[PDB]
Amino acid sequence: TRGANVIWFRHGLRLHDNPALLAALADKDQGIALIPVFIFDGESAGTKNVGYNRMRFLLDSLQDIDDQLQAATDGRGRLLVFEGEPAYIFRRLHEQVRLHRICIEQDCEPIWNERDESIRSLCRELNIDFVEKVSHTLWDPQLVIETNGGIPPLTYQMFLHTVQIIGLPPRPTADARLEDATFVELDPEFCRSLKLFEQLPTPEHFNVYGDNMGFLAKINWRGGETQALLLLDERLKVEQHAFERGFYLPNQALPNIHDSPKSMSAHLRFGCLSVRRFYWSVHDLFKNVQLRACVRGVQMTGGAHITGQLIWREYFYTMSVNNPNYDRMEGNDICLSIPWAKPNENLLQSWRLGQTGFPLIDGAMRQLLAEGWLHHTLRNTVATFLTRGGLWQSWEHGLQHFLKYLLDADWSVCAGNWMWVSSSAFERLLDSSLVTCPVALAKRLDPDGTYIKQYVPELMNVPKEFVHEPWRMSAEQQEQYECLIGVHYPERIIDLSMAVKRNMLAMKSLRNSLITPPPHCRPSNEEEVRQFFWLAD
Ligand SMILES: Cc1cc2nc3c(=O)[nH]c(=O)nc-3n(C[C@H](O)[C@H](O)[C@H](O)COP(=O)(O)OP(=O)(O)OC[C@H]3O[C@@H](n4cnc5c(N)ncnc54)[C@H](O)[C@@H]3O)c2cc1C
Numbered sequence: 001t002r003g004a005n006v007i008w009f010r011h012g013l014r015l016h017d018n019p020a021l022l023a024a025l026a027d028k029d030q031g032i033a034l035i036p037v038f039i040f041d042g043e044s045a046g047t048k049n050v051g052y053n054r055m056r057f058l059l060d061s062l063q064d065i066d067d068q069l070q071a072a073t074d075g076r077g078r079l080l081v082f083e084g085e086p087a088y089i090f091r092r093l094h095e096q097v098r099l100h101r102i103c104i105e106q107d108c109e110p111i112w113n114e115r116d117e118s119i120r121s122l123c124r125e126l127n128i129d130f131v132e133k134v135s136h137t138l139w140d141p142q143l144v145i146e147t148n149g150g151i152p153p154l155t156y157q158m159f160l161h162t163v164q165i166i167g168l169p170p171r172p173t174a175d176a177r178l179e180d181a182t183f184v185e186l187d188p189e190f191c192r193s194l195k196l197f198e199q200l201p202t203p204e205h206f207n208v209y210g211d212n213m214g215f216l217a218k219i220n221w222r223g224g225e226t227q228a229l230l231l232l233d234e235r236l237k238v239e240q241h242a243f244e245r246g247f248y249l250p251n252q253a254l255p256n257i258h259d260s261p262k263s264m265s266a267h268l269r270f271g272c273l274s275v276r277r278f279y280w281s282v283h284d285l286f287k288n289v290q291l292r293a294c295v296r297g298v299q300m301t302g303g304a305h306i307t308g309q310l311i312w313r314e315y316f317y318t319m320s321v322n323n324p325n326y327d328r329m330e331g332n333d334i335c336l337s338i339p340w341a342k343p344n345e346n347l348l349q350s351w352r353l354g355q356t357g358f359p360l361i362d363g364a365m366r367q368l369l370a371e372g373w374l375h376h377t378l379r380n381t382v383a384t385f386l387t388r389g390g391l392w393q394s395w396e397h398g399l400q401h402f403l404k405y406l407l408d409a410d411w412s413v414c415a416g417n418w419m420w421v422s423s424s425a426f427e428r429l430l431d432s433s434l435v436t437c438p439v440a441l442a443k444r445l446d447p448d449g450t451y452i453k454q455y456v457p458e459l460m461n462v463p464k465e466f467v468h469e470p471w472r473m474s475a476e477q478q479e480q481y482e483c484l485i486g487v488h489y490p491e492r493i494i495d496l497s498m499a500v501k502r503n504m505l506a507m508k509s510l511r512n513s514l515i516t517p518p519p520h521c522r523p524s525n526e527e528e529v530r531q532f533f534w535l536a537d
Contacts, residue, residue: 002031003098004184006090009038009079010045010112011136012105012271013061014225015068017172019133020103025176032100033182035093036069036079038062039086040206043115045270051211051405053372054266055203057223061272063200064224072178080186081197087118089194094126096190101129105271108134108141108317109411110324138169138275138310141318152319154334157524159315172277211405212353216370216455221261221407228273231264236281239306243285247293247300255534257375257445266373266407268313275310282306297531316416319521327415328396329423336423336520338510340387340394347391350493351382352401354456357485357492359468360442361385363455370455372407377445380421380533381438387422388503389436390494395422416521420532424522425507429529434537436500442468444536458488 007024015021024034042048045058066079082089093099102123107116116132123130134140144162145152153159163169186196203209242248267273286303295305319334320326329335350356354365364378374382379402385391386398395418402418403409424430433440446452449467453460459467461481466473471485471492478484485491511517523529530537 001033001097001184003100004033004035005100006035006037006093006102008086008102008104009036009062009065010104010107011269013038013045013058013065014228014272014274015065015176015178016225016229017135017274017277018105018176019135019173020105020131021176022173023131023133024101024103025178025181027100028181031182033097033184034077034178035097035099035184036065036077037089037093038065038079038081039089040081040083041086041115043111046403046409046411047206049400049404050208051372052203052208053211053221053405054407054409055206055208057221057266057372057407058270059200059203060221060223060227061225061270064226064272066200068225069178073181073183077178077181077183081200083195083197086115087122090119091122091126092190092194094128096186097184099126099128101131103131103133105135106132108137108321110320110322110326111411136271136275137317138279138314139163139166139318141314141321144314144318145321151519152321152323152334153315154319154519154521155524156312156315156528159318160311163311163314168283169276169279171280172274211369213366213369216366216457218454219261219371221266221371221373223266223270223272225272228264228267231262231267232273232278232281234262235264236285239282239285239303242300243289243291246291248295253295255375255377255445257378257451261373263373269408269410269413275313279307279310296534297527313410313413316413316420317410319416320412326412327399329394332419334519334521335419336425336510336517336522338423338425339506341392343397344391344393347393347493348397350490351386351391351393351398355490355493356385357471357490358385358438358496359449359452359456359459359470360438360446363452366455368402368405372405374406377441377534379417380435381441383418383421384430384436385438388431388507390496390499390503392499392503392506395419419521420523423520425510426517427523427526427529429526430523431500431504431507434535435533437496439468456489458483 005024005027007021012018040047046054062079062081069077069079090102102119120130143166147166148162153162264273268275282303291300293300298305298308323332323334325331329337351365354362356362361382364374364382368374383398386393387395399415399418402414406414448464452467459470462470462483470483470489483489
């Protein structure tokens with residue numbers, strides 16, 4: 001009629017703290033309608049290399065957006081979901097109703113520049129206003145890069161030093177008022193021609209089915225903005241009591257791998273939860289009060305033990321902005337070139353399928369397949385095991401496996417964590433036994449083997465004395481407990497003692513040749529490594 005404005009969802013699947021959505025609603029007074037649009041283009045929202053679990057999470061998030069639009073407009077507003085190329089869909093959508101502007105939340109990762117540029121050039125041709133808003137991150141990552149002298153900060157301490165100069169991140173924007181917004185009804189033949197979804201599809205519609213084994217799902221995850229704001233309320237409620245109490249309880253600070261999907265990592269990846277609303281609700285809770293207690297070596301004053309977790313996310317996102325080779329070693333200026341072993345498919349497949357013979361490694365990789373989420377310490381041990389603390393394979397193989405099955409699986413965050421853990425050759429402590437030994441770690445995180453028997457069911461009838469080291473059982477014990485090593489449960493795919501030694505020498509031989517390291521993504525110091533891996537020291 002009078003025209004319409006497009007709020008194009010890729011990430012930022014939420015209605016709160018959406019600067020692009022407010023800009024799309026900025027013309028309600030002129031009769032300009034609103035068109036919520038999501039496009040399955042085969043890459044957006046991490047849909048090029050995706051498994052069933054994350055695809056289910058994304059569809060849960062899209063259904064939440066559509067339901068909120070209906071709830072606030074008495075069923076007048078809908079989320080239009082297409083399938084195809086955006087420039088093809090948007091030009092013909094412009095032919096039906098005159099588009100005045102297309103608003104998006106900035107996808108700062110370089111893997112999105114090609115897609116966003118095709119729409120940018122399409123907006124110049126059709127005289128469509130192209131509105132881009134920085135919102136998926138705490139700061140504009142360029143602002144951090146220009147402050148650091150044109151290069152992104154390569155250490156977590158240098159990133160903190162930069163954002164201290166910049167100041168606190170912006171506050172979340174107001175909530176969108178959709179009750180008075182106008183929406184369009186498209187011609188059914190146009191919805192016919194451009195493959196607009198009548199109902200929200202299932203992952204099977206994109207030929208995505210059960211994982212590499214299937215049904216070990218003990219816990220499940222609900223995507224969407226509504227579930228994200230519920231998990232945040234429960235988190236702040238736990239922090240409110242700890243803030244009033246003045247300290248964490250001893251078990252609240254313990255790594256709990258037997259817990260539940262209370263994590264909000266996937267919700268922050270897809271933008272179901274605003275990172276700024278997260279940051280400032282934690283800030284307002286701890287505001288103007290001096291505490292003394294620490295959480296895993298990090299102070300509690302000002303909620304720094306939580307807001308700092310949102311800094312790690314910002315610190316890996318910023319590093320990749322102007323680096324299109326961020327997910328590989330060859331050609332990456334911020335990654336240490338390490339002589340990894342050439343790809344060994346048998347070792348890689350045994351690591352993906354959780355068939356390494358090491359119980360904690362196998363249980364973590366099978367949980368990744370079943371549920372798509374691992375605790376930060378479980379991601380630590382399986383990353384070290386694949387790389388410097390075991391198989392000596394390239395971190396690129398694990399990055400590609402994580403990006404398919406993780407519920408979060410940010411392109412920059414996952415790649416940065418893989419380089420941070422695997423390619424920091426000058427971090428002496430990283431190669432210690434407190435990190436590379438999954439047996440000693442399994443006895444700390446899972447003393448009774450309950451987590452191991454949950455995801456490695458062949459070790460169910462194995463007693464606690466042998467559940468962490470089943471190869472220690474005698475022949476009579478292996479046959480009594482119905483678990484023969486090499487039949488029911490495979491043998492260790494590698495001799496860990498000789499492998500860790502071999503790999504430690506390769507790191508020492510690597511440092512002595514460079515003598516002085518080139519600037520690369522690395523821990524800031526040894527205290528940061530203790531905090532990163534949850535070391536009891
Ligand atoms: C090999 C490896 C791969 C990883 N891949 C991802 C990934 O794809 N996506 C992802 O969000 N996180 C990733 N991380 C970081 C970490 O595994 C998760 O952020 C964390 O397990 C999420 O659980 P949580 O929300 O309870 O953590 P919390 O302690 O509650 O963290 C709060 C928030 O801060 C962010 N955050 C916390 N730690 C880190 C970190 N080290 N780096 C970046 N962000 C952080 C999380 O997104 C989370 O929502 C990876 C870590 C490793 C070692």
